[PDB]
Design a protein around this ligand. Structure first.
Ligand SMILES: Nc1nc2c(ncn2[C@@H]2O[C@H](COP(=O)(O)OP(=O)(O)CP(=O)(O)O)[C@@H](O)[C@H]2O)c(=O)[nH]1
Ligand SMILES: [Mg+2]
Length: 167
């Protein structure tokens, strides 16, 4: 069975944990319980192939930034999440991408840019600006909501497809 090592990264509060829990458990977490580091393993069928997804749900709190080196070395693909109502979280994407590129010594690391909380009316990052950033990196971009499940399966499955091409 093919195993995919996915790592979910992004600023504190963007919805990394809510996206992961929505994907796996099909329910939305309203509370804000900051993460240190959680991991999940789930079997799913993607494009007719039974896949084992290893999902690492990382800390957005900068206090845990020293843990990034290990997960960036081990991870095969990265879900780079910002929230569409948090401009700082969008600005922080570039830092996560440079860090990943440095650790893996490559400009071709599987990544997907995710603009989460698309159910909210309080947008501060236009879809076009995020699509332009993703085009500059050569990676896919999808908007998601951990509350409604919009784009959630597509975001994770797209990241798996980005890893799979290299095999
Ligand atoms: N409306 C809405 N709220 C969301 C969405 N995703 C997460 N939230 C809310 O945002 C808050 C933070 O979500 P959480 O999943 O804990 O974020 P995180 O990025 O894991 C936080 P940390 O980096 O500290 O672990 C919570 O109140 C959660 O309900 C979403 O798509 N829509
Ligand atoms: Mg979390």
């Amino acid at each position: 069975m093919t195993e995919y090592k996915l790592v979910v990264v992004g600023a504190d509060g963007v919805g990394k944990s809510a996206l992961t829990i929505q994907l796996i458990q099909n329910h939305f977490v309203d509370e804000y319980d900051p993460t240190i580091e959680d991991s999940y393993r789930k079997q799913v069928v993607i494009d007719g192939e039974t896949c084992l997804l290893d999902i690492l749900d990382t800390a957005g709190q900068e206090e845990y930034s020293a843990m990034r080196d290990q997960y960036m070395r081990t991870g095969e693909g990265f879900l780079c999440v910002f929230a569409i109502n948090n401009t700082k979280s969008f600005e922080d994407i570039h830092h996560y991408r440079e860090q990943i590129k440095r650790v893996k010594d490559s400009e071709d690391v599987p990544m997907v840019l995710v603009g989460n909380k698309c159910d909210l009316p309080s947008r501060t990052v236009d879809t076009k600006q995020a699509q332009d950033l993703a085009r500059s990196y050569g990676i896919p971009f999808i908007e998601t909501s951990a509350k409604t499940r919009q784009g959630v399966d597509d975001a994770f499955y797209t990241l798996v497809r980005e890893i799979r091409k290299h095999k």
